[PDB]
Amino acid sequence: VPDYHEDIHTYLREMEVKCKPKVGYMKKQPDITNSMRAILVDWLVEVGEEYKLQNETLHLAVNYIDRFLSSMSVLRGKLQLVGTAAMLLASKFEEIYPPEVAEFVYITDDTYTKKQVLRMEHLVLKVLTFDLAAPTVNQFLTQYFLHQQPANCKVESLAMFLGELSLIDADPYLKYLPSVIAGAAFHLALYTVTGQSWPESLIRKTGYTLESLKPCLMDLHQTYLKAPQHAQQSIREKYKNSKYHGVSLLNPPETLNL
């Protein structure tokens, strides 16, 4: 709706810096690692598919978990509790029909009570001070997508998928902003599917070039090449679905020749 297209892009650029989690964080959590987190985000992916949630809800919940864990140490036994209250907050925020709290207690296999999930819900809101409208990778991709010629649904799903892949690994994806991961994701997809590259108009729009997108893009490319071997597979499975044009079955380029 190009009356406000640029204004929003701008505002989201400013907000993505304020909602950035801290890059180190995991080093300060005595009882958790980047691997358990990966285990957790993979699980939110299946919860999203089990309950049929938007990919947006999924991006927001991970943003809530990362910010929450930038400031609260948590024991390994409560990580899923945090993850679950996050998913619920994201759903209430983003979904037309959020799953019910009990359903959230139910996919944990009664690991937590309704009471604990509700109490967790409230602490997450306190800790985030209700700043829930966070820019995500999904929201940048969607805008970048208006820049296609012509639109290409395989391109769209594959960018979404690469962007989803980046949610799984804090090292190194925490060090990049959502708009940057989205550029690297959009470019890889375009290039993988059609051989085209990050377009001039997205340069005028974002101020980013392949040169500025390079680092994240080098990481995102290894992530994509290594994806079949990753301990987490829910996103790949997920993306074998025709809802997503089965794009996880495509083959990554061996080189990106930059």
Binding site: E50, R76, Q80, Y106, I107, D109
Partner: peptide, 9 residues
Amino acid sequence: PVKRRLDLE
């Protein structure tokens, strides 16, 4: 299965 408490130890 989704229905599962995640194991981490």
